[PDB]
């Protein structure tokens, strides 16, 4: 007596993300051997974390030049991964595919100016509890911020803490929300000595606690 399969109806249809592996249609083939091939990266997140990438700025240039006028805030950008400032960054590009992201995002600021020019820069993260960014270096002092003088070590890295009501935050801000989903982040040059026409390069990389999940497919 043949076993009765009693196959179900309405399920078992082929799925693009289905875990099931298709039956082999060819004989076993041994491919050319590759052992310890250089540059292999097991996880996409590790590559973003291992190597930092630049942030888009005025006229497609990454470094924020010291304002000619007396402005203490060089640039202010939304904390959300889908932000114009981070539009060209590699970390946002991998993050765009993932539905939502969690964990701290590291920002690396490295001074690229002559030895005679010395300037002091402050990076302050503002939580989304106000209609607008800290207006000035003093007003923004109350929120989490780091002030670093430019010395022998050109690059200072400040990790943006991830704090939100929801455990996970959407990578791309929806059109319906007229305000940033998460908090803006502002870079302020509190004091500059002979820094006219001096550029500071700012970059963003995945944090140690940073993680992405629920991969989906947004059009790029």
């Amino acid at each position, epitope marked *: 007596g043949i076993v009765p399969v009693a196959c179900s109806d309405g399920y078992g249809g082929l799925v693009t993300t289905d875990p099931k592996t298709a039956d082999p249609a060819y004989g076993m083939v041994y491919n050319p051997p590759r052992t310890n091939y250089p540059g292999r990266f097991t996880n996409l997140l590790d590559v973003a974390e291992a190597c930092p990438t630049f942030l888009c700025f*005025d*006229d497609g*240039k990454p470094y924020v030049v010291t304002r*000619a*006028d007396e*402005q203490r805030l060089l640039a202010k950008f939304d904390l959300s991964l889908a932000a114009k400032h981070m539009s060209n960054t590699y970390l946002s590009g991998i993050a765009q595919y993932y539905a939502q992201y969690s964990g701290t995002i590291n920002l690396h600021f490295m001074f690229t100016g002559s030895t005679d020019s010395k300037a002091r820069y402050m990076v302050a993260y503002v939580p989304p509890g106000v209609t*607008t960014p800290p*207006d000035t270096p003093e*007003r923004a002092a109350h929120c989490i911020h780091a002030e670093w003088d430019t010395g022998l070590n050109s690059k200072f890295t400040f990790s943006i803490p991830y704090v939100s009501a929801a455990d996970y935050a959407y990578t791309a801000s929806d059109v319906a929300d007229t305000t940033n989903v998460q908090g803006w982040v502002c870079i302020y040059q509190i004091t500059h000595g002979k820094a006219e026409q001096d550029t500071l390069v700012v970059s963003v990389s995945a944090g140690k606690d940073f993680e992405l999940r629920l991969p989906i497919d947004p059009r790029a």
Partner: antibody
Amino acid sequence: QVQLRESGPSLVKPSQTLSLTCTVSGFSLSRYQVSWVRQAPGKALECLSSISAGGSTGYNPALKSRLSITKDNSKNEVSLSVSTVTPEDTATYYCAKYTDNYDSVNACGFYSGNYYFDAWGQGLL
Amino acid sequence: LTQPSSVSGSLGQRVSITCSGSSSNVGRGNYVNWFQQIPGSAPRTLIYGATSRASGVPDRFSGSRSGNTATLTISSLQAEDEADYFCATYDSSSNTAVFGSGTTLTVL
């Protein structure tokens, strides 16, 4: 819809302070920088003053300390008062809202080149 | 700044207005803002950042800036296009936004 309206005296006696008020409707006055631009008759515009979201109250350097600008978020009104008004400085006054907040402040808007004035309003002489 | 007092372009013909200042007023890195003002009405911003059009502005308007010269070119000219055009940029040496003398575009 975005609407800016200017309310103030058209004729003022010289050697007196001119006070103007910009009545804003359509957008929250705390999320957009407002800039006061004055133009001289048949002459090129001259940016006069501006106030950012949090009330930076930046003033044009050439006429700095000759005028004071105060903006109240609750009443949705931006007020610009010019002291020592003179016959030579006679032109239409335009109050506009910058897309960005505190984009420049020392210069009343358009210093970055990323955000531009969205609504210039009816204007007032 | 220094720009032509008036430029005349026929309907359906591209018209180019050139705004020229100084290295300090307009840097190669820096950009200028183009404002179109109808007589008897408040000024309207057509080009912001010197290469883009503000929301609610038609795609025909084009802005190109080379060196110290910023040029606004209008294609498919229409009756509404006739207006006074002002180019606005921020001069680092002056430390105050500097506006152009004014260019009036007339359609024949």
